[PDB]
Amino acid sequence: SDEQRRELEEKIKFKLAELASKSEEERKEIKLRVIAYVLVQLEDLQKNLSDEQRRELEEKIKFKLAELASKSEEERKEIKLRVIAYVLVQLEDLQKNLSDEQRRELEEKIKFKLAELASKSEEERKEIKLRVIAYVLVQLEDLQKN
Ligand SMILES: [Cl-]
Ligand code: NA
């Protein structure tokens, strides 16, 4: 819906507003936490998905990454922030809708991905970030069909 689109835009920009007061060190940590969370959610979804469904989505990520290459650093920074805020919206929902147990394993699953991400080189680290941004833009584009 258009009225449904407008509500999600407000939420994204509202979430971004809480980011303005946080510090570059806090913001770096939030960015890294968001990435790790998208990664566990990615991994979990690849289990429950087909060999063909995994090819189709992998190419969806790549086509999205190609659109990003077409954009200016200003737009790319904007896009990066929208995705991060949109993920933070879900993390808010997630934080309310599950109890201390489900919260627990997720934190651990987050912690592993952060560990896995720290062990990577800088080129690969940058590559994972961008794929995570592209993937969220993918599912964001699917949801933005309703
Ligand atoms: Cl970026
Ligand atoms: Na690496």
Author numbering: 3 to 148
Sentences from the paper on this structure:
Deeply knotted proteins, whose topologies may introduce substantial barriers to folding, thus represent an interesting test case for protein design.
The crystal structures of kcTRP3d.1–3 validated the accuracies of the designed molecular models and their intended deeply knotted topologies. Superposition of the structures to the original designed atomic coordinates of kcTRP3d produced all-atom rmsd values of 1.84 Å (kcTRP3d.1), 1.43 Å (kcTRP3d.2), and 1.90 Å (kcTRP3d.3). Atomic force microscopy (AFM) based single-molecule force spectroscopy (SMFS) was performed on kcTRP3d.1 to assess its single-molecule unfolding behavior. Resulting force-distance traces acquired in constant velocity mode showed the expected sawtooth pattern with a single uninterrupted unfolding peak appearing at approximately 50–90 pN. The tensile strength of this construct is considerably higher than other known purely alpha-helical domains such as spectrin (around 40–50 pN). The thermodynamic stabilities of kcTRP3d.1, kcTRP3d.2, and kcTRP3d.3 were studied under equilibrium conditions using the chemical denaturant guanidinium chloride (GdmCl) and unfolding was monitored using both the intrinsic fluorescence and far-UV CD signal of the protein to probe both tertiary and secondary structure.
